[PDB]
Amino acid sequence: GVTVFFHAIISLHFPFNPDLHKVFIRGGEEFGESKWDSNICELHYTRDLGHDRVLVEGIVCISKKHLDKYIPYKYVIYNGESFEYEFIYKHQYVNRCLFIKSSLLGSGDWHQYYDIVYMKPGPRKDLVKGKQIAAALMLDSTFSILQTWDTINLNSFFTQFEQFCFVLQQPMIYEGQAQLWTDLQYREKEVKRYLWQHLKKHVVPSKLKTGLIVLFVVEKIELLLEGSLDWLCHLLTSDASSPDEFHRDLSHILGIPQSWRLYLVNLCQRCMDTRTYTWLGALPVLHCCMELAPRHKDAWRQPEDTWAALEGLSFSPFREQMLDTSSLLQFMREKQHLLSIDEPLFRSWFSLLPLSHLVMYMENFIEHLGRFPAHILDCLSGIYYRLPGLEQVLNTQDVQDVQNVQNILEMLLRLLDTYRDKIPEEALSPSYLTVCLKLHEAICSSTK
Incomplete structure (x- = not known):
């Protein structure tokens, strides 16, 4: 049939002892047709958890008919001289319902995480502490698998984590029929804070693999890294x-079907909406998920998000409202090596900067342009997308902003003259002439 692993937390309601007391599960005719007629299974005690609590574990074999449906189960404890029910x-009678979805069964082993056992001698608070302890124990158990890394x-890890999340998010109890947890209706904020600190503590000592696992966990349990995302952005910083x-490390984990793109887009969009810049380091991984497009000859037709490799992100508000640019360019400089391992990143950073500082960007990163000459053309493209702003700037006959625009055009001429010999014919295309025409038109129009 199928093998099931059980895990149960026992608490001060019973001062467990490995000799005084024994633990068993009793069930209906489902696991085996001895409906409440025997100790359906015996559990082995392998942990002590303090708080007077302890973890017990068991194994059972179940025929397959029960897939896609509900088995009923209940916990029974032997107090040394008598058997009590949890x-x-x-x-x-009120019991628990175990459900085994064939969707999660890949290898055929079902882990029934997240079982709390209270004996009849607050209860909400007890079950909150219990829910926290259980989610911590599940994170630890799952992370234990990574001890050796491969696709297997x-x-x-993903199978056990998804089984955990399926039972925690659908914590069903049985009363004739299966129903959603009401005595608690498992609560988040109190548990999610503690689990967030636990994840931070355990993860803080390959970095990218750890960061991607943390991201998967955070998004699946619907967690937020409260006001401190920089640590996760660092872990994903190559x-x-x-x-x-970079591709060697990312290949195995990203090769596993998941919504990596959506998770990384959410992460970057939050790090922007909270006005931080460490996310700039994670962009390469999103690009690896993006499945980027060729340099279509009529590139100027492309919208900016597709050109900047930022499909799914609202870069413009962050670009304008964010003020601290000096720190942004110092960060870009410290992490300049990233520009070598990801072609699009130069475009993306270019898009996230405001007009004023664009020149220092092309100045701070001119050696890169000597090493990747074709990126010079992307500067023209970026200015094309800036074209609205330059008009609003030129219509206001401000000496400072006009000087900024003049400096930008002088920088472009300096680059095109200096690297006239390096610009490869592949990156070149007639369409770029159109871009310069549009640029010229705007200036002729605005310059009064």
Whole structure:
């Protein structure tokens, strides 16, 4: 049939002892047709958790018919001289319902995480502490798999994590029929804070793989890294020297079907909406997910998000409202190596900067342009997208902003003259002449 692993937390309601007390599960005719007629399974005690609590674990074999449906199960404890039934502080026989979805069964092993056992001698508070302890124990158990890395261990980790999330998000109880947890209706903020600190503590000592696992966990349990995303942005910040090594690390984990793009877009969009800049380091990974487009000859027709490799992000508000540019360019400079391992990143950074500082960007990153000459043309493209702003600038006959525009055009001429010999014919295309025409038109129009 199928093998099921059970895990149960016992608490001060019972001062457990490995000799005094024994633990068993009792069930209906489902696991086996001895409906409440025997100790359906015996559980082995492998942990002590303090707080007078303890973790017990068990294994059972179940025929397959029960997939896609509900088995009923209940916990029973042997107190040394008698057998008692567990208690669940629900306001209303009442038991638990175990459900085994074939969707999550990849290898055929079902792990029934997240089981709390209270004996009949607050109850909400007890179950809150319990929910926290259980989610921590599940994170630890799942992370234990990564001890050796490959596609197999990753798939096992994802399977167990998805089973955990399926039972926690659908914590069903049985009363004739299966129903959603009401005595608690598992609560988030109190638990999610503690689990967030636990994840931070355990993860803080390959970095990218850790960061991607953290991102998957955060998005799946619907967590937010409160006001401190920089640490996760750092974990996903590559220290690579070449593109091959970056792709080598990312290949296995990203090769696993998940919504990596959506998770990374959410992360970057939050790091922008909270006005921080460390997210700039994670952009390469999103580009690896983006499946970027060729340099279509009529590139100028492309919208900016597609040209900047930022499909899914609202860069303009961050670009304008964010003020601290000196720190932004110093960061871009410290992480200049990233520009070598990701072609589009130069365009993306270019788009996120305001007009005033664009020149220092092309100045701070002119060696890169000598090493990647074709990026020079992307500067023209960026200015094309800036074209509205330059008009609004030129219509106001301000000496400072006109000087900025003059400096931008002088920088472009300096680059096109200096690297006239390096610009490859592949990056070149007639369409760029159109871009310069549009630029010229705007200036002729605005300059009064």
